[PDB]
């Protein structure tokens, strides 16, 4: 009943793949066939993808490769890669429409997890290349990044000591001047941001084609601005890089705080404060500017007339999901629900950074207080007497035929599908200002624990809260 | 005892959502 947060689903070419842990298989549902009002049999389009060698560990996450030919099955005690079978025939179904397809499975680093019983996989990520062979990066509890190629499963291509809870890739960037003596070529690499539980964020440039001494140096900790009295907390649980220019990093805490960090380039110290660093390698270390901090309503806050009944700080790990349709939007999944966060200042930051050094009006427009938009979309713990129904799978469909939709699957296999969106000033902007919402009532999941009606008091408090918001 | 009270609260919230929807649709019809 301590059902952990998982991500056991992915979408491939408009087919939903759902991992079944008991059968060690994917169930496939063609979403485009469900749109056709076919008067005939509620079973036309389900296929089962069987692992030829099943995982020997509990799968917590499913990761589609950038090449869309491989699926990583990720657990705290191992990783296994499933090769996606070929599509052919009249419907473009797997292996021509066979009900049960045997899929080749490949264990990654198996000997390391079997020999080191105390080792835990913290995160796995794909290297963000669509043109190269798929490489898997493993972050483990020994603070080591291990890079594997699907051609050599036993020997990591690269092992990097971080002497870490999460990491994510930024977009392909030109390396700063100084990361390589004397090449006239702009070398490009992926920035990997690496988060510690302490909130400390590090940067590393990774290129798999070039083994240069500068490519794979750990940089940081990246200085955070402004200074915070608590140093931004010690319960950091997830990192997401948004594909924005400049890069925006989202740091999430177990308490439900979200820090929006703008990545700033390091300045060359203008030559008048030369007081003593004897390290003659000015690596221009980038800085993190915390533009905004946002607290998620992880559990529904009720007004009780007792301001002192122990805020049971409902802390839980948050998982961050990039929106493929809106680069300034992302989604948060946690044990008690789903939130969406939209950076409403993003287009103004872009306008300000595109404005030359003389546009004081754009800075004043950015400095005009603009909070992000937070929407609590799904609440799986609507009442205090109820256990949450943890999210087991989360995805965003972006397809021209299906439209834009969120899919959530709970731990009780409840499938929830939601469409997502993609006189100073005209009088219309003033009316939009009045109609601006700061909160909404989430979709409340009634967790189907048959055996008591909730207390009438908690139901009245929930109705009171909902009525007040309306 | 908790189940009947939760069902009563959920029914009252559904009645209020239905009432507010009717008031919004009257306000839209008037405006």
């Amino acid at each position: 009943k301590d059902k952990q947060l998982r991500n056991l689903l992915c979408v491939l070419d408009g087919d939903l793949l759902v991992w079944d842990a008991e059968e060690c298989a994917f169930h496939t549902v063609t979403l485009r066939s469900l749109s056709v009002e076919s008067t005939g049999s509620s079973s036309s389009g389900e296929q089962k993808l069987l692992c030829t060698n099943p995982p020997l560990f509990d799968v917590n996450e499913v990761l589609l490769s950038p090449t869309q030919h491989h699926v990583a099955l990720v657990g705290s005690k191992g990783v296994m890669v499933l090769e996606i079978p070929k599509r052919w025939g009249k419907k473009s179904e797997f292996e021509g429409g066979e009900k049960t397809v045997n899929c080749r499975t490949i264990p990654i680093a198996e000997r390391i997890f079997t020999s080191s019983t105390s080792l835990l996989l913290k995160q796995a990520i794909w290297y963000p290349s669509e043109t190269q062979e798929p490489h898997l990066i493993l972050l483990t509890s020994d603070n080591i990044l291990r890079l594997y190629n699907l051609q050599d499963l036993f020997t990591p291509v690269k092992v990097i000591s971080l002497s870490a809870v999460a990491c994510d890739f930024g977009p392909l960037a030109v390396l700063p001047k100084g990361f390589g003596q004397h090449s006239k070529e702009d070398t490009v690499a992926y920035p990997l941001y690496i988060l510690y539980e302490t909130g400390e964020t590090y940067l590393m440039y990774i290129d798999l084609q070039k083994s240069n001494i500068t490519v794979g140096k750990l940089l940081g900790p990246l200085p955070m601005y402004p200074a915070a009295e608590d140093n931004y907390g010690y319960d950091a649980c997830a990192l997401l890089c948004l594909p924005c220019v400049p890069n925006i990093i989202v740091i999430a805490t177990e308490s439900g705080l979200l820090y929006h960090c703008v990545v700033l380039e390091g300045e060359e110290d203008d030559e008048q404060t030369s007081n003593k660093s004897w390290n003659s390698s000015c690596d221009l270390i980038p800085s993190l500017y915390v533009f905004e901090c946002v607290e998620l309503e992880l559990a529904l806050k009720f007004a009780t007339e007792e301001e002192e009944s122990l805020e049971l700080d409902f802390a839980c790990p948050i998982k961050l999901h990039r929106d493929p349709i809106c680069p300034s939007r992302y989604h948060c999944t946690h044990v008690a629900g789903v939130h969406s966060v939209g950076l409403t200042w993003f287009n103004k930051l872009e306008k300000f950074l595109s404005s030359g050094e003389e546009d004081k009006d754009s800075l004043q427009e950015l400095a005009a207080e603009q909070k992000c938009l937070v929407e609590h979309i799904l609440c799986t713990k609507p009442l205090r007497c109820r256990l949450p129904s943890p999210i087991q799978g989360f995805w965003i469909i972006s397809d021209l035929f299906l439209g834009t939709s969120m899919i959530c699957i709970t731990c009780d296999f409840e499938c929830i599908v939601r469409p997502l969106l993609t006189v100073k000033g005209p009088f219309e902007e003033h009316i939009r200002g009045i109609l601006r919402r700061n909160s909404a009532n989430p979709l409340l999941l009634n967790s189907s624990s048959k055996d008591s009606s909730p207390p009438p008091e908690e139901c009245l408090q929930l109705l009171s809260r909902a009525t007040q918001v309306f | 005892k908790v189940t009947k009270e939760s069902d009563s609260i959920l029914n009252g919230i559904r009645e209020e959502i239905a009432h507010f929807q009717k008031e919004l649709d009257d306000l839209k019809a008037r405006t």
Binding site: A440, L462 | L10, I17, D25
Partner: peptide
Amino acid sequence: QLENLINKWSLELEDQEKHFLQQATQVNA
């Protein structure tokens, strides 16, 4: 049971919000 009732009222509220915005647009026209 309470959670199912909350989820139902949240969906009814989002549907009523959409209907209200459509009616407000029609009244403005």
